[PDB]
Amino acid sequence: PPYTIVYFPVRGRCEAMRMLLADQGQSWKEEVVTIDTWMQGLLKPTCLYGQLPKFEDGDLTLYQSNAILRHLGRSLGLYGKNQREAAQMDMVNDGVEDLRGKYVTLIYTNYENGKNDYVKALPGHLKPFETLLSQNQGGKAFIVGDQISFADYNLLDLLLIHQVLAPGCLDNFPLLSAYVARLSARPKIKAFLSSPEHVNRPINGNGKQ
Amino acid sequence: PPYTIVYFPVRGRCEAMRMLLADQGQSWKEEVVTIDTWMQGLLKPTCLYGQLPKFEDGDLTLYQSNAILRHLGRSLGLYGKNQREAAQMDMVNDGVEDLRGKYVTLIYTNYENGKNDYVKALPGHLKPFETLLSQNQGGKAFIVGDQISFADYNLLDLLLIHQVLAPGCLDNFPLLSAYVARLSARPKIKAFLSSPEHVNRPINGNGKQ
Ligand SMILES: N[C@@H](CCC(=O)N[C@@H](CSCc1ccc([N+](=O)[O-])cc1)C(=O)NCC(=O)O)C(=O)O
Ligand SMILES: N[C@@H](CCC(=O)N[C@@H](CSCc1ccc([N+](=O)[O-])cc1)C(=O)NCC(=O)O)C(=O)O
């Protein structure tokens, strides 16, 4: 510490880590970068890959949203209790990323014509997560193990944004519906989901949701 | 152990882990699944996400190529010496994945028309890796730290396949050119790169390279 998040004035690839820090009683400094500030002309600070977000933990600067999640997962003890749980948590997080990549592609490159085809193929992509829950204590606890991990926060966010995209996409998935209701019920998270800084902030950076 | 890899008869998303195991004196069992075997019916829905590869370490089954790399990175001690190096190794591996995703998109969905545009934008994507090397002992050692990690194996593979795609794409990058020559010089890897099981195996699953 201290923690600092540099990103656009949207949820996107930072709402997951913002939920993690908030649930673990942590506090961070929000540093906004408008699209005007980003793209305008000759301006280049030191963006490794040229994109955002950028995280700062004490005197450690990091890039890549998932690399940041795994960092907080190691330092804050949210990466399982053994090798098996660690590997399974990566397998799950990667699956979440694959679907998140598709969602981003839809919103930014083919929202109008692709929406119908996306929502139609969606139940096929959400099914694996449903299967994972049943295999672990009947989906009573978390995606992997007994305690909450970084994978749970990323998965929760993926499902929350898909409920806005497709209103009843979880109806055919009992476990996933209860899983979202359960994790949202947690006092720390609930406070965040009902916070002005979260509500007033749009999901994506183009008005499409 | 024992180690087992289930995948298509191509390099693709498994040549990196095959180099890692080979360099660490490990031995695995190769289990091939033809495209014909893929299209069947009842004997098919057994894959978590519905894709490959599938790795087996003793009595631990895993999916997602990157999750498998990180697993071998923890058990075989190829994940750095501290938190900083671990986070930086993830940041690098994720960058490699982003470019690998683009490469796969080109080869399978737009090889004919997209090739020229890809090769033209390529030097902009390889630049970050060049910058990383100079920042670490002038690119004398490895991508991160003093010892070889899983990130190095994945990066080496990404560059090797891009040299086939675009013959002189590394000419403008001194450090990356020496980095590939150095890691390829390693006796264990060199033996693998000159092995029949590797040579006779095509890079992608559609004849395009
Ligand atoms: N693999 C990377 C991808 C990072 C990424 O997508 N970065 C985007 C922001 S997320 C998507 C996004 C982009 C822009 C806005 N906006 O409001 O302007 C909102 C959301 C970016 O920097 N875009 C600008 C650029 O490429 O130069 C990661 O996970 O960190
Ligand atoms: N994010 C995942 C992606 C896995 C993946 O790309 N799986 C592909 C194989 S790699 C690319 C590939 C595909 C097919 C062949 N082939 O010879 O038929 C070769 C390579 C697959 O299962 N494709 C079939 C399907 O989607 O059902 C990971 O890294 O594991």
Matching residue, tokens 């930014």? A108
Cβ(A175)–Cβ(A139) under 8 Å?
A: yes
Structure tokens at A136: 């672990």
Joined tokens for residue B173: 């990058």
Q: B128, A49: Cβ pair inside 8 Å?
A: yes
Return the SS3 of A207: coil
The answer to whether the beta carbons of residues A119 and A113 sit under 8 Å apart is no
- Give the residues after which the backbone of chain B is interrupted, taking a C-to-next-N distance over 2.5 angstroms as a break: none
C-alpha to C-alpha distances, B112 to A20, B106, B125, B191, nearest whole angstrom = 44, 9, 21, 34
The ligand with the least distance to the CA atom of B96 is 1
- Map A167-206 to HEC letters: CCCCCCCHHHHHHHHHHHHCHHHHHHHCCHHHHCCCCCCC
Quote the tokens at residue A18: 């913002």
Eight-state DSSP code of residue A62? E
Can you read off the two tokens belonging to residue A45?
């600070």
* Alpha-carbon gap, residue A35 to A95, rounded angstroms: 29
Per CB-CB distance under 8 Å, the chain B contacts of A94 are 64, 66-67
Is residue B62 within 8 A of residue B54, CB to CB? The reply is yes
What does the CA dihedral A21, B151, B99, B128 come to, rounded to 10 degrees?
80
Please indicate whether, in this complex, the C-beta atoms of A67 and B94 are within 8 angstroms of each other: yes
Q: How was this structure determined?
A: X-ray
- The whole-angstrom separation of Cα B11 and Cα B8 is 8
Both structure tokens of B187: 């006796």
Which one is the CATH code of A79-186: 2.60.40.10, 3.30.390.30, 1.20.1050.10, 3.40.50.300? Answer: 1.20.1050.10
Are B60 and A88 in contact by the 8 Å Cβ rule? The answer is no
User: Which of A7, A8, A64, A158 for mutating ligand 1's site (highest number of atoms within 8 Å of CB)?
Assistant: A8
Between CA A128 and CA A123 the distance in angstroms is 10
Q: Is B154 in the pocket of ligand 2 (CB under 6 A)?
A: no
Contact B86 A75 (CB under 8 A): no
Asked whether the beta carbons of A94 and B70 are under 8 A apart, the reply is no
Parallel/antiparallel/unpaired status of strands B28-32 and B3-7? parallel
B205: CB partners within 8 A, 6+ apart: B8, B9, B10, B12, B35
Compute the half-sphere exposure of residue B42: CA atoms within 13 Å on the CB side of its CA: 0
DSSP codes of every residue in chain B: --EEEEE-SS-GGGHHHHHHHHHTT--EEEEE--HHHHS-SSS-TTSSSS-S-EEEETTEEEESHHHHHHHHHHHTT-S-SSHHHHHHHHHHHHHHHHHHHHHHHHHHH-HHHHHHHHHHHHHHHHHHHHHHHHHTGGGTS-SSSSS--HHHHHHHHHHHHHHHHSTTTTTT-HHHHHHHHHHHHSHHHHHHHT-HHHHTS-SSTTS--
The three-class DSSP label of residue A79 is coil
Peptide bond into A174 cis (omega under 30): no
Q: Decide: A52 and A8 in contact? Cβ < 8 Å.
A: yes
Could you give the dihedral angle defined by the CA atoms of residues B104, B108, B114 and B116, in that order, rounded to the nearest 10 degrees? 70
Q: Return the domain boundaries, chain A.
A: 2-78+187-208, 79-186
User: Known binding site for glutathione: residues of A?
Assistant: 7, 13, 38, 44, 51-52, 64-65
DSSP secondary structure letter of residue A77: T
Please tell me if the CB atom of residue B10 comes closer than 6 angstroms to any atom of ligand 2. Answer: yes
Asked whether the CA dihedral B91, B94, B100, B105 is positive or negative, the reply is negative
Token pair of B163 as six digits: 């040299």
Q: Which residue has the tokens 């209860």?
A: A178
Q: Are B129 and B123 in contact (CB under 8 A)?
A: no
Any ligand 1 atom below 6 A from CB of A8: yes
- The answer for residues whose C-beta is within 8 angstroms of residue B110's C-beta and 6 or more apart is none
In degrees, to the nearest 5, what angle opens at C-alpha A132 toward C-alphas B77 and B65? 40
Residues in the annotated binding site of A: 7, 13, 38, 44, 51-52, 64-65
B-chain CB neighbours of A128 within 8 Å are: 48-50
Residue A38 to residues A14, A34, A44, A205, B31, Cα–Cα distance (Å): 17, 6, 9, 13, 48
Would you say B27 and B21 are in contact if contact means Cβ atoms under 8 Å apart? Answer: yes
Nearest ligand for residue B37 CA: 2
| Cα of B45 to nearest chain A Cα, Å | 11
C-alpha–C-alpha distance, residues B20 and B66, integer Å: 13
For residue B104, the distance in angstroms to the closest alpha carbon of chain A comes to: 14
Angle between helix A65-75 and helix B83-109 axes, rounded to 10 deg: 150
Determine whether the interchain pair A87/B62 forms a contact, defined as Cβ–Cβ distance below 8 Å.
Answer: yes
**Residue B83 known to bind ligand:** no
Q: Which of helix, strand or coil describes residue A11?
A: coil
Phi first, then psi, for residue A5 (nearest 5°) are: -120, 120
- For the record, the structure tokens of A184 come out as 């949202």
The response to whether B13 counts as a known ligand-binding position is yes
Measured between alpha carbons, how far is B74 from B94 in angstroms, rounded to an integer?
17
- Top CATH class of A2-78+187-208 equals alpha beta
Q: Residue ranges of the alpha helices (H) in chain A?
A: 15-23, 35-38, 65-75, 83-109, 111-135, 150-165, 174-185, 187-193, 196-199
Cβ A59 under 6 angstroms from ligand 2:
no
Looking at residue A20, the DSSP 8-state letter turns out to be H
What secondary structure letter does DSSP report for A39?
Answer: S
Resolution (A): 3.0
CB contacts < 8 A, A to B, total 72
- State the Cα–Cα distance between residues A65 and A15, nearest whole angstrom: 10
**A28-32, strands of its sheet edge to edge:** A28-32, A3-7, A54-57, A60-63
A→B interface, C-beta within 8 Å: 48-50, 60, 62-64, 66-67, 70-71, 74-75, 83-84, 86-88, 90-91, 94-95, 98, 101, 128, 131-132
